[PDB]
Design a protein around this ligand. Sequence first.
Ligand SMILES: CCc1nc(Nc2ccc(S(N)(=O)=O)cc2)nc2nc[nH]c12
Ligand SMILES: [Cl-]
Ligand SMILES: [Cl-]
Ligand SMILES: [Cl-]
Length: 252
Amino acid sequence: SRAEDYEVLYTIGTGSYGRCQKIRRKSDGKILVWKELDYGSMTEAEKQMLVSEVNLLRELKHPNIVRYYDRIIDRTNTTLYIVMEYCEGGDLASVITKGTKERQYLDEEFVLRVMTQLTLALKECHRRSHRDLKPANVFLDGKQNVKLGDFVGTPYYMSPEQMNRYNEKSDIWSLGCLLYELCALMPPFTAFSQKELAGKIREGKFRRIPYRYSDELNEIITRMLNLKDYHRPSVEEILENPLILEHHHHHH
Ligand SMILES: CCc1nc(Nc2ccc(S(N)(=O)=O)cc2)nc2nc[nH]c12
Ligand SMILES: [Cl-]
Ligand SMILES: [Cl-]
Ligand SMILES: [Cl-]
């Protein structure tokens, strides 16, 4: 509940909200992270908004969602610390980077693990009712478990619905693009312009994922990338696919 209860080990990274630091809890030595934000220049209404936000976030307990632990306030440094579980495997964007640089395609078993566990995380989030579902916000623990994490760049994953005129099947489309990039080490739609990217997305054409991946996996990813949302599989229909087995799920 107090900053002195933890010791900063080191800065993991910055960007987006604020600064992300790997920390250790003094009482038991548990390894966590915290995101330090600066609320001082936010309105009272803005801090109220974010308070209800992180309350809803504290109302989320799922093995495939980054676990929230605590919140700490420091009026001296006008800093709000949000304490969360540390995922030692890193993010998925780094895994895709490593595969691209090493010219090493990822195992199909790993793609199935990500598909299964991210589908379960999305199911949970749909039960508790424009996103940022992308490799940089998906993390891995030490036991192959996948955890869902919380402008100049091109929106490579933006559905045609969210581009013409958002629903759960849009989440399915974003998952499809993420799994595609895991298999092919590149997004399904490439462009230097945002207009060209919009055109390519609307036409809905892409290369098959590399041939080392099963026809069943390509089939389900292609179904997720259908132009019509009502043709994309629901969470339930994804989980019914014969590709998805027990060992693809989380394990403590
Ligand atoms: C930065 C956001 C974040 N990161 C991590 N872990 C982690 C990240 C990168 C690497 S890396 N590129 O050195 O291999 C290793 C571990 N856990 C987290 N939990 C909540 N937000 C987390
Ligand atoms: Cl690592
Ligand atoms: Cl390659
Ligand atoms: Cl190919």
